[PDB]
């Protein structure tokens, strides 16, 4: 069940919300995590501007999915990001450990960010809160351009 | 094995230190995503001020577990902080995912704090490397006044 | 209406303004009680939640500001008057005789709930475009202070 | 009645000086309307400037209410900010909401300021507290300055 | 056949190329309005200058902004964003603006006439466009620009 | 006994605003250590922001203080605020240092708070020099909310 | 003699206060004129502190400055700041030309200092305008501080 | 020209104001280019070159606008509209076929040079010092540009 | 004679480069009130925004100044500033004490910016000091604007 | 005897340092009156300088000695503050009320910093907790600085 | 050794004062070709190494700034001029016909190296706790910068 | 003849020049930069606090304009020399004493240092013949006359 508010969205729109919202939580934590992974371990040729580039897409990440977490609250649901629910809930593949080139962290990136990127545009859509609208189009605008970033480093 | 460098600090030192770090990069990477799991799922006395305490708690874990995985680095391992290794590698109980109350939280915040405050505290004296030991300190000495500030919040 | 280069037609420009005068008001009120709240609490909690309110109240200022300056762009007027919100207002009369922190909270619980209830219906209510996203980013600050009041209800 | 403290103001200087915090809260949460009212709604020269002008007045007000408020609460009363008591209880003309010129909405403005700020000019004669009478003094100095700016720009 | 730019980018191949042709329209009416802003801003003169005159540094600032969000949007789409001399001057649906004007008035009126212009397609173009992420960038746009349109007007006599 | 200066306050009213600075000066500094004191060793409900509200208190104190001093030196006196002075010449009760919880700390600082805020207002009305009331009101405004933020955290 | 103002203030107390007002706009005119004069034109040990120290005095004095013509204005009359005024109305003696010690300096600096000083302190409770009270209230700390400044930078 | 009190002579006026609306419309040209290439490089070094080029687009308006100013204050029109830009600027169309940042760098650099080369001359040809101070100023910044921007070729 | 100093410029350079910076510090002093005056006393049309506009003026026209006083004083000279020389060396002529009008202002102002700034243009390169040239030239652009601003809000 | 902790820093250890942390409280609070008491009294050669030099040492004793303070009550203890105990458990000797000459204070301050810096230096190797002798170094490094200044101020 | 009330050992000051103009000294060596490779650099990935250097230089500068007012406040005299900089330096005389970013980086990374491993034993052979945590914190910052430039070789 | 390549088509006899210049004023410059810090570390006495701290900030501006030139010679083509061995070896500035210790010591030096850089720059600007490099120098100039005025102007 729910948590009470005298916020009156309606039911099933609520649990459906929370739903979506909570797997885009977890899809972004992942992201943010083998944003970091990525970040410490590269190696070569442009590095420390990609590796700036990436501290920043670190933030916009942690922003975006505490709105996430917060407007799944707001509707009386439990906002999900435990190490154990992430590890067991993801669609992202696990980041790779053995690479090592800064093209390398490119692509694995680039495959990753995509797949969330590709996700997170499509709930715009499909999603019947609002407000869930409005916060999923302004993640989708990063997502999107930390795509494009990321693609046009590779060389 | 590790990575060349110029660093000269010796093989063996080098080794064990990595490890020391990671565990505690592993360690500080859940406590960071417990914290914020807390942050959103809280609600009771004394809540927006606990909120927004965990908040900062949250930024200065994430800016120490960044120093660690750079030590690690810069020593030629590989820093490890992705969901899969730390849900793997984690020391920590999985956090309850539906406790609610302020106090609820705090309590269970203040039970894996003071394990990781407690190892660190450790890790400082046996830790080989005097840059890292010196990096634990700093970190340290916050956990134990984010520690108390945790229990000093409990009812 | 006034005379404006700005295209939208009359129709819609004369539905739009009037949701944004009812917005202006309830915003304004919601404004003030806020306020109220803020100076005639007292008890557990007080320094925190005291602080918080500023918070809203700003936000709320600025968010009403928007919705007013809308509805002069269409071609309106913005009615801000102490007189008008008196008697459009459809909030209950803020109570003058409670103190406690949780007293005010329950009493700002109420009435923030039933604005946030109303402004995300209007989203999806008006065809002026740029109006249902001024109405959404402050219905998402709305529900986001609705969910601090009562999240700090014992 | 009035509430308990330590605060040891004698009892008739309390209930006195209430009153009138009240008053002049009553009339600058009035002028914060009406300052509003008046730069929405202005069309003609010199436009710009004006308008902004207004939102520096609007910020001032609200300050100086917030410390009238305060310091009635502080003396144990109650201070009265509702929609209801403002209506009720403002000394200032209705705003007229059919005047659309730069100019008219200045001369409206500058009736009602007027007002207020002679009101308050000699309330800090009057009132025994001596914080009080440091308070209006202070936003006595910014009443007659928004009214001279104000008149000034009147042509 | 696509002359499309490879991306991981799922948008569909249609919305892609309609949508970046969209994006490039708006690109160029903004850059003619920020050349023109400042254009009016250097040459006004008469009552009310020195407001008026600062007061179109400001919506510079914005038009760059929403501008420069625009043509980044085409690129991600896998297009290429167009904003040259030569592109704006044979592609803006913009009438040249008058350079024998002084008065802070008629450069009023001339602003008015084109802020309105571009003021009225973006805010069509919002409903008309099938990318989510474009209406939410010219929405953003489309408010600045119907508060600026409100600005000018009203400083007009 | 006074110091030449070319400031020139009659030889008496120097002499008494001076004794009258010092006693002021003396009882703020008292109540700040007494403000970092209860800081420190506050543990329960609504722990953290009670403590930052308290900093907030300290750092106020401490500019009012400071402007009391100089106001002495500038009549040609000496200022006082050696511990071996406050502990001789503080009319404030020995702080407890057995209490703990927040409730506790904010009674004992309400206590203290108290008397210098009810001392310092009378203070305003029977000093002679101009200056030294003003100083006297800006703080007697600060000591007067801060009793209230005191008093009102108390259950 | 003055111009219409809705500003109610008893015209004869308005015509009083503005020539105080002027009198003290005249003399802090001269003032932040000598304060350039011996910031520029000094030289000899503890140089650079006391030049920098004097270019803080300005920025306060022209601060005072506005406040008074301001008012002035508002009270109905002319703001009377021009260097003829400020050369035919002055009750300072001109700045010396051939010192250039900073002792020297700061001597010059200080018997003029005073004057002003000494004088706005009397004009505090001189003044029928409660503002213009409030006024040279504050200024009359600045200038007393400065003058403790220079004066004890004196060997 | 317009009236001024301005005394700077006639003949140098008409001359200044001249070699000004030229020095205008480069920059501009410029600052269109340097966002041309900002959008559409992808390849090595691309975060870096992409940010470094705002920068030269600040810097570049910065510039522009003072030269408008000064040709407006001596009693001329700055002119730096769409169509006169076109029609008298000294760069070739910039290329809008390519994707390099290796070769959006070739293409900067071409017209970069150009205008720093044509600036730097102009620092000692005009007779008002003023402008001749405010064209070294930004030679100097287009001669650090071209320096970046040549730097970052391999 | 000038003040001894290792600055090696040539002699006759220095005095006659003295002679000329006192000469703009007078006349930007002058500039300076005057600009003041204006700013105090002006009502009509366009008040707000070309009162404020003024104090910008005063700012950039206070920082020139003082660099050439410091230049003078440099190449071993005294910087000249006082209110007494500023009354008989100004060449400007003296500013009007009736004029209310925002445009009668204006047109005052407009008369005695562009002598000054018709004459620091010249000192550009009438003057063999370099660095004083740099100066000149800095403030001319200033003044040059300046004029411009104030001429281009006359109707 | 000490508060309940889940950090778990042995008892007998957790007691020595607090203990040890409490004895720097007292000094750091000593010097920070001190510090303020000489601020106040000094004039002669060097001022200004020495003055404000000394609201900076103020302001860094005072957050050293909080980072004490919250490491002591942390460990369980309680961490004392109050003008009685700085009487009575200083180490310093009172600081001279009739001294006035900037040299004769500097003198006064060395002597008691020298004594304070001297025994934390040492303070740092006795101390068995780690994050103390970090808190202390620190403290030290600012304390061993400010020695400098001090005694290179001297004549 | 100049008097100072600080009573650290006559002995442990000496030998300590000693070991600080050694680290004032490499480090003021190695901000100088810091600005070096800073400015005669060039190819790929030029602008943000270049920046990199800036980023290093404040620091160094700050740490060595430390090092030195450390050993005045022993009672030692600290030393900085090129004079002895030249005469007492370990590093090589950087190269100067040197040009491409990966020449640069290399001839970097080989003298942070020299006097990051330096300055890490020098942790352990100090008796002075206030310079052992100095050295430290230097250390760190130069362990990061030898790992960002050798991060950056192709 | 043996310049880096580069699109700037300033005269090469020029460039040749002025990077012989500019090279030579940041010999000076980096010089002063070290001997400003080893004086603001080792000096003592009367008045030490405000000295100290106003050298930092000499050293700041220095260091900004020295950085400046550099960048100039680059531009033009050349190799910005800075490394301790070509300051030694290629300065005209007198060796800094290291057993001075006074304030007064410390700024009796620092002028006649001061000075000497101080001097050149200012017929430098008429010398050179790349205007952006007078520019440079001019501004910096202005700062060096500036602090020679503070230096000279706290002498006893
Ligand atoms: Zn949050
Ligand atoms: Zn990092
Ligand atoms: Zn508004
Ligand atoms: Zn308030
Ligand atoms: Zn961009
Ligand atoms: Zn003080
Ligand atoms: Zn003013
Ligand atoms: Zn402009
Ligand atoms: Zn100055
Ligand atoms: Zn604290
Ligand atoms: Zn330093
Ligand atoms: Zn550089």
Known sequence: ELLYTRNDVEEHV????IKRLNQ???QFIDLSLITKQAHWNMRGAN????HEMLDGFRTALTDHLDTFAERAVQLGGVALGTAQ??????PLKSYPT???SVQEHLKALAERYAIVANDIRKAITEVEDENSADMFTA???DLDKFLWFIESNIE
């Open 14 to 17: 609520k649990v459906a919300t």
């Open 24 to 26: 885009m939580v977890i």
């Open 47 to 50: 590095f420390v501007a990609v």
């Open 85 to 90: 629910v992430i590890n067991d809930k993801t």
């Open 98 to 100: 053995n690479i090592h």
């Open 139 to 141: 993640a989708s605008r």
